[PDB]
Structure formats: structure tokens, C-alpha cells
Amino acid sequence: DLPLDPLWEFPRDRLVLGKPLGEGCGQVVRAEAFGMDPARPDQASTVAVKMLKDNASDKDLADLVSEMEVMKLIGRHKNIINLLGVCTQEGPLYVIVECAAKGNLREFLRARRPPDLSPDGPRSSEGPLSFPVLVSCAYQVARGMQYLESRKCIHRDLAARNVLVTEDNVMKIADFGLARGVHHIDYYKKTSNGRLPVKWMAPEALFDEVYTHQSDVWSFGILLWEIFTLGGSPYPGIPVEELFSLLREGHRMDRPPHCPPELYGLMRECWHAAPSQRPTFKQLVEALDKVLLAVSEE
């Protein structure tokens, strides 16, 4: 059956599968792994494991294998979900990646929105989220995307919900190696979560089925809006039908409340019609870095 890759192959009996982590289009499971670091063979670690759905066609198998091989080639970076190991021999196909304890960025932000709350303590009107951390989140997603771009990897669905947050609040770009079938997209279809993925698509991607890294930049611009709305849904109260014509008329989202003009400027820059007139991820990393270092250091 599948070829043995000793560099990545991990003994399946060293896995202890646990509770699911989400939906997927295979099954994702939180698992316990022993000896992932071969220097510490009896040391436990929490990982994420992707497997095949019950009654999976040969396509579902080919998709996961394809996704497995993409992650091998892209390599390691602190701001993406990294491949840890695989199980290809003598049993079902397992793909083992890093686990993000705090879930996706959208839920992270929404669950940490600021407080008519009865004031206790010295910091009652002080929410968990502060401006510099928000910028840091944006900066990390940018650096992560930059790495992917350098690996000639286009995400095609960059969004706050496709960014994962670790125990130490590190942003990791999720699901970057998926074959999402961009020729059969139901633009009207609303996900289980209530999301309309069409709201993250660049015009050249939506209208012309053209994806580039500049297409991801457009998406990143939408992600920027999500961050500083603390998990707000883009184009509020606009159904897909209206979004079509609005985008054709060149409509853009308004400046969100409590958002400095520097960042709304970057958003609008990412939403420039001409892809060449949008910033690169390298420029985004640099721009966001300047804002990050401009914080008051007491």
C-alpha cells in the first residue's frame, strides 16, 4: 500500500486517541502521543490527529494523502500548524500535527470581548484584549502567511476561523494545504457556524476564479477587520446577492469602532481592486511591525 517514510513515520501504538476537535470535511481528533521527541520516549504530549471518515471514497483517501505530502514539503514555521508525524503502516492513515489549546482566532476574540457590569477590583473596565496584543495577533498571521508564500503556498480561504491559537497565544495558520475545489463553490452556502466564506474572497477569485498570493492579501485584509471587531462577521447584514452587486460597484467595509486610522488604512490597502496595488505579506509584516514597536514601553 502506502510507502514508508521513516523520517515522518510514527508508531500508531504510541497514540491514544481522544475527543474530536471540530467538523472537517476528515475526522480531527485530539490525541495523546508518547515519545514524539525520541530523546524522551515515555514523555506525553498533546497532539492533533486527522483520519478518514467512516465510509470514505478513494478521493477522500487521495485528498488526505495529498494534504499529508504538502505539509512535508512546506516545512516548519512557528506561525503555522506543523506536521509532527504520520501513521501509514499496518492500520488506518493518521496525520499528526500540532495541537492548539485555545481553538480558532475568531472564537478566541469573541470570547474575550470587553464588559453595564458591576465594577469590582481596580480593573473592571479592562478587558482581556489590549491593542498591542491585537496587533501582535495580526503580525503573527502575516509572518505565517509570508512563510507559506515563500513556499509557493496559496491558502485560498484565509480567515480568523482558519487561524489557531496556542496555549501561549501564538497564531498558527490552519488548513493551508487543503484542496478546496475552487471550481465548484456554492457562494450562497452558509456553513454550520453561520459563516459565508464568499465574504473572504478576492474579486479576481470570486469573479474570475483567479487565486494568487495577492488574493490571500485581500483575505488578510478581511481578517484584519475581524481582529479589531473582536470576531465580527464581515459585511454585516449583507446577503450574498447584495454582496455581488456591491463588490461590482466597488463597495468596501466601513471603519470599525475603536480602530486607529493606521490599521483601517492597511485594511483598505489589502482591498485595493488591482492586486498589484495591494501590499505584499512582506510589506504587511513590516508595516505591522512598526506599529507593534511603537507601543508605549513605560
Ligand SMILES: C=CC(=O)N1CCN(CCCn2c(=O)c(-c3c(Cl)c(OC)cc(OC)c3Cl)cc3cnc(NC)nc32)CC1
Ligand atoms: C473545513 C470545514 C470544517 O468544518 N473544519 C472544522 C474546523 N477545523 C477543525 C480544527 C481542528 N484542528 C485541525 O484540523 C488541525 C489540522 C490542521 Cl489545522 C491541518 O492544517 C493543515 C491539518 C491537519 O491534519 C492534516 C489537522 Cl488535524 C490542527 C488542529 C490543532 N489544534 C486544534 N485545536 C482546536 N485543532 C486542530 C477543520 C475545518
